[PDB]
Nucleic acid binder design. Structure first.
Lengths: 74, 85, 82, 162, 79, 80, 276, 68, 94, 73
RNA sequence: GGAUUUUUGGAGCAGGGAGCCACGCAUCGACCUGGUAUUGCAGUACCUCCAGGAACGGUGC
């Protein structure tokens, strides 16, 4: 696309199912409620996938920005 | 700024302080702190009440801490739930 | 709001602090500054996997703190007022 | 022209061609090796070529010294406690000196890391069995006089002198 | 002189497929086509992949935003 | 910072530097920046295994320095 | 002729490199520092300089009424440092006495006095052990058969240096009783001073310390004047001039007239305004 | 917002020690105030990777393979 | 080929590892004067060869005459004055 | 308020603990915003090593206690 | 005054077993024996090839 930046991409993905990988290898799937300037992230109906396998169903979750490796829409 | 605390991802903390509800904090130390948020800030420093700290050593362990201050860098994840209920 | 301000009020309290490197510190706060650099007296400090050592004074770089365990008595609602 | 602290302090200091820190003590007409304390153990190599030293002795404890170039001096004897002051001595170049008897080379057996040894242009060189004698008495040497110590020579030196 | 940010701007324009070296993790690297990026070197990658150097295995990701925290190094790949 | 001024004072002197990874670099400090970025020359490096090497020219980022040893020639900023 | 009492033999001998200012060449011994370290040792502040000196006075008391438990680490370390200080101070303040003689005397007293009965004997509790065990003993018999036991072997093998250092602190402090008293006095005095008093006293100690041992342009002006401003003369070597007054002086010069006259343009005052 | 003093090293061949025990070699083509680098003809220590960006964050040490 | 600060050596046993070759070369040639630097590569083109650079020119000439055909690691070395001036010499001169 | 908490210990001998767990003991002569420290006559314990005049970066500092009083010199 | 050089963290976690001695997996590197090619004037990740040897070294789990 004509330049698609970090910020708009993430904003487009609000209201959507996402999965976030953390640096530590945990993964969290849920609906992205919001993100902020520092790229802290809020998920609803979160699920946890560790070793790529469903571990725990967690609900509403804040992820501190420094933990994030990458975010994927899914 | 208050708006960003109110509606942004930190609203999780803002909501927990207002409703005096419990939250589980997954923590860098591989420990989890389960309790109520008395105060919080940008960095996710917190003043916590009725904290149940849980961890593992395999053997699970826990311990009660009535009053404590958490430096926010140690935060991995903060969870709000039907936990308080 | 700025919670370091709250910690700066805790001079002359005795606390237990857990460090990022696992070390445990019990002593009486002489001063917390804006960087959360914390200074104590009458300190019993137990590095992970040692028996305690006692120090008359100890000064901690703020960033190395994991968390403070506060006195049960502490009147938080007072201290949270500005 | 005594080898003095003052002498060492004004001496050319540089990184040599084989990437080691070397101190230049060439052509000063030094007669006796002394006062090395002042180098502060900061050199990998020390060049003592073209001087008048008689005995390879007098060194302080120098843990970093790995190369000693001692060309064109008058070395006729080697000190006995060399490994105690130079534990990692790996290369010793003694070309064109005065070692005359095979037995005078005996003190080099105590230098455990000594791997490169050069004794060319010394009278001792023409003594019968000079090469085999060095190989058996200083087995830690891998290259002697710029020639590889080979297995066959080791065995041959094991027969003679066994 | 070429400035590093500009190189990226070039990668962006070219739609060259990019391989990223991550911080303190050698066994995995990330790949994708830079669509956009920001002042923090946070990248939006398209049709992205996790590359396991040990397992010779690839994990398919699609639309990725990688935080710049992890960036050690940026290289281009012909594929 | 006061330590920074004292570092700049050591420019032109032989100094020792340990990195965050414990490699030890000794040689002449050519330039020291405000952020502790260090240009040096005619280095001896001593790795974590103990082995040494020799380098002509190096530059180390300030953040990735654990510490520096400076001459004692400087010790004699006593005001502070 | 007559300025320095020191002989050529010891011309670079300086006492100030041996004595600090607070010691006044043996008049006092500076124990404030050790009061600091001590505060660090007791992990509190209930202890004043004077109460600390009161503690030092202990040095049977230092053995049976110890400030801290004699098996405490911080304490034993402190005691070591302090002991060392007192000893060096002692020999420092009395150069003329044979140091080795004194050392050996003390060492022999240490070895010989202890062995039979701990040198410390009580009509009630019997014989005390110095440093290593810290226990009494009914009779000399059980005392002797205790000096071979695994316990005493362990202790005498671990706490030897400390015990010996303690002992030295003891005997050296005894030999310096006059200096100890002198200093304690000083402390009380300075303490009872005012501000001005304490200041003047310090002045005195200082003077005693550092006294001979034997008495007998601008830009705002060059811009105003018009100089250091870039300018060039073309006829002279495309030369540069830094001021307009100076270039106006170039018009009458040797080389400028040489360029004119040798150029074929004759000298003096018609050509003054020349550039190219 | 200072620059790193690297003009001296411009267009020279260099040896780069990176975190993770990683080492690469190449020619300095440019830099910014964060010490992010552009390195040309880069080689992973050996396989040729071409012109690359190294984030200054992960730069431990550099060594010139030339004389400056 | 006029006398030169740098000597070109060929006919060297190419089985010696590069760093060992250079260190023995340095050792051997130190007897005639300070060796400023040694250039030796193992490429197909350059294998079995080395350029030895000396501070003094008299040192280079002495080395050339005295070590012509010296057995080094088994082979007789062939020495000659280099065709061109060494980069290091040119920089040290101007 | 006072800023003294560091300035008090200045000139004193100080025991400093590093992030890897080393012990640096030297004379505390200067500090700054980052807690970069200047340590005179400094030794390292883990194995005692004499270092001398040391500048330590604050990033890698954990903590400090008073080890002994100032040397008079 | 939490976004690369310091203070809001890339950290976290994993070693005993067998009879003083010895050790799983993956990647890279010289490296050591034989034999074999190459005779070439340069500024260097590294450097012939063929067969055999590794009770070699470094990093990660």
């Amino acid at each position: 696309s004509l330049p698609l930046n970090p910020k708009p991409f993430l904003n487009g993905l609000t209201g959507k199912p996402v999965m976030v990988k953390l640096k530590w290898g945990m993964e969290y799937k849920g609906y992205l409620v919001s993100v902020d300037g520092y790229m802290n992230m809020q998920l609803a109906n979160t699920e946890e996938y560790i070793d790529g396998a469903l571990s725990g169903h967690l609900g509403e979750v804040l992820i501190r920005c420094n933990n994030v490796l990458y975010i994927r829409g899914v | 700024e208050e708006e960003e605390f109110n509606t942004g991802p930190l609203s999780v903390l803002t909501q927990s302080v207002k409703n005096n509800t419990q939250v589980l904090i997954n923590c860098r130390n591989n420990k989890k702190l389960l309790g109520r948020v008395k105060a919080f800030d940008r960095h996710c420093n917190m003043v916590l009440e009725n904290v149940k700290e849980m961890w593992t050593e395999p053997v699970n362990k826990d311990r009660y801490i009535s009053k404590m201050f958490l430096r926010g860098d140690s935060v991995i994840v903060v969870l709000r739930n039907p936990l308080i209920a | 709001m700025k919670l370091v301000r709250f910690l700066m009020k805790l001079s002359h309290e005795t606390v237990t602090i857990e460090l990022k490197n696992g070390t445990q510190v019990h002593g009486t706060i002489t001063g917390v500054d804006v960087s959360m650099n914390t200074h104590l007296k009458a300190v019993k400090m137990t590095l992970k996997n040692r028996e305690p050592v006692q120090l008359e004074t100890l000064s901690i770089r703020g960033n190395n703190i994991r968390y403070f365990i506060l006195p049960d008595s502490l009147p938080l609602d007072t201290l949270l007022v500005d | 022209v005594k080898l003095t602290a003052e002498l060492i302090e004004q001496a050319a200091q540089y990184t040599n061609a084989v990437r080691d820190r070397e101190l230049d003590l060439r052509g000063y007409k030094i007669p006796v090796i002394e006062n090395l304390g002042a180098t502060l153990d900061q050199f990998d190599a020390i060049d003592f070529s073209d001087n008048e030293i008689r005995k390879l002795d007098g060194f302080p404890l120098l843990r970093r010294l790995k190369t000693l170039l001692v060309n064109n001096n008058r070395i006729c004897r080697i000190g006995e406690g060399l490994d105690q002051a130079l534990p990692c001595l790996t290369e010793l170049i003694l070309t064109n000196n005065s070692l005359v008897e095979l037995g005078d080379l005996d003190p080099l057996a105590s230098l455990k890391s000594l791997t490169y040894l050069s004794i060319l242009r010394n009278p001792v060189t023409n003594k019968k069995h000079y090469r085999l004698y060095v190989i058996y008495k200083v087995p830690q040497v891998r290259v002697l006089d710029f020639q590889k110590v080979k297995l066959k020579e080791r065995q041959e030196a094991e027969k003679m002198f066994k | 002189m070429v400035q590093p940010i500009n190189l990226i701007f070039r990668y962006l324009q070219n739609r060259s497929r990019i391989q990223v070296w991550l911080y303190e993790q050698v066994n995995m690297r990330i790949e994708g086509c830079i669509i956009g990026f920001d002042e923090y070197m946070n990248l939006v990658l398209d049709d992205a992949e996790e590359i396991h150097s040990k397992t010779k295995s690839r994990k398919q990701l699609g639309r990725i935003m990688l935080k710049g925290d992890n960036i050690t190094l940026l290289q281009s790949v012909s594929n | 910072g006061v330590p920074i001024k004292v570092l700049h004072e050591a420019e032109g002197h032989i100094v020792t530097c340990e990195t965050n990874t414990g490699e030890v670099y000794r040689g002449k400090l050519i330039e020291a920046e405000d952020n502790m970025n260090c240009q040096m020359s005619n280095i001896t490096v001593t790795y974590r295994d103990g082995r040494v090497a020799q380098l002509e020219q190096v530059y180390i980022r300030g953040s990735k320095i654990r510490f520096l040893i400076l001459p004692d020639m400087l010790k004699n900023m006593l005001k502070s | 002729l007559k300025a320095s009492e020191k002989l050529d033999y010891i011309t670079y001998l300086s006492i100030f490199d041996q004595l600090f200012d607070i010691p006044k060449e043996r008049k006092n011994a500076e124990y404030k520092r050790y009061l600091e370290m001590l505060l660090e040792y007791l992990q509190d502040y209930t202890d004043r300089v004077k109460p600390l000196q009161d503690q030092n006075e202990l040095f049977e008391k230092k053995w049976e009424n110890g400030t801290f438990p004699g098996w405490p680490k911080e304490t034993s370390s402190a005691l070591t440092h302090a002991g060392a200080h007192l000893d060096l101070s002692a020999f420092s303040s009395w150069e003329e006495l044979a140091s080795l003689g004194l050392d050996r005397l003390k060492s022999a007293l240490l070895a010989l006095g202890l062995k039979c009965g701990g040198t410390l004997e009580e009509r009630a509790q019997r014989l005390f052990s110095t440093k290593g065990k810290s226990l009494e003993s009914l009779d000399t018999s059980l005392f002797a058969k205790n000096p071979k036991s695994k316990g005493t072997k362990r202790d005498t093998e671990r706490n030897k240096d400390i015990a010996f250092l303690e002992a030295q602190i003891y005997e050296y402090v005894e030999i310096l009783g006059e200096q100890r008293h002198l200093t304690h006095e000083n402390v009380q005095r300075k303490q009872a001073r005012t501000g001005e008093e304490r200041e003047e006293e310090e002045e005195e100690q200082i003077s005693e310390s550092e006294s001979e041992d034997e008495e007998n342009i601008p830009y705002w002006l060059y811009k105003l004047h018009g100089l250091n401003i870039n300018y060039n003369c073309e006829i002279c070597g495309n030369y540069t001039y830094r001021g307009p007054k100076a270039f106006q002086r170039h018009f009458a010069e040797w080389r400028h007239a040489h360029g004119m006259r040798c150029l074929g343009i004759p000298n003096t005052a018609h050509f003054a305004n020349v550039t190219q | 917002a200072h620059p790193p003093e690297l003009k001296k090293f411009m267009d020279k061949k260099l040896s780069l020690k990176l975190n993770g025990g990683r080492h690469v070699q190449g020619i300095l083509r440019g830099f910014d105030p964060f010490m992010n680098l552009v390195i040309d003809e880069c080689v992973e220590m050996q396989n040729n990777i071409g012109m690359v960006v190294i984030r200054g964050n992960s730069i431990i040490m550099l060594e010139a393979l030339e004389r400056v | 080929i006029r006398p030169n600060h740098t000597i070109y050596i060929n006919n060297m046993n190419d089985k010696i590892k590069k760093e060992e070759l250079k260190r023995s070369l340095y050792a051997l040639f130190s007897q005639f004067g300070h060796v400023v630097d040694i250039v030796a590569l193992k490429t197909m083109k350059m294998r079995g060869q080395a350029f030895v650079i000396f501070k003094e020119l008299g040192s280079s000439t002495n080395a050339l005459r005295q070590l012509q055909g010296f057995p080094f690691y088994g082979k007789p070395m062939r020495i000659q004055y280099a065709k061109t001036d060494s980069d290091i010499i040119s920089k040290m001169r101007g | 308020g006072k800023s003294s908490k560091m300035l008090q210990h200045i000139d004193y001998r100080m025991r400093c603990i590093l992030q890897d767990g080393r012990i640096f003991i030297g004379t505390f002569k200067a500090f700054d915003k980052h807690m970069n420290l200047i340590l005179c006559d400094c030794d390292e314990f883990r194995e005692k090593r004499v270092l001398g005049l040391v500048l330590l970066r604050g990033e890698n500092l954990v903590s400090m206690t008073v080890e002994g009083p100032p040397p008079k010199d």
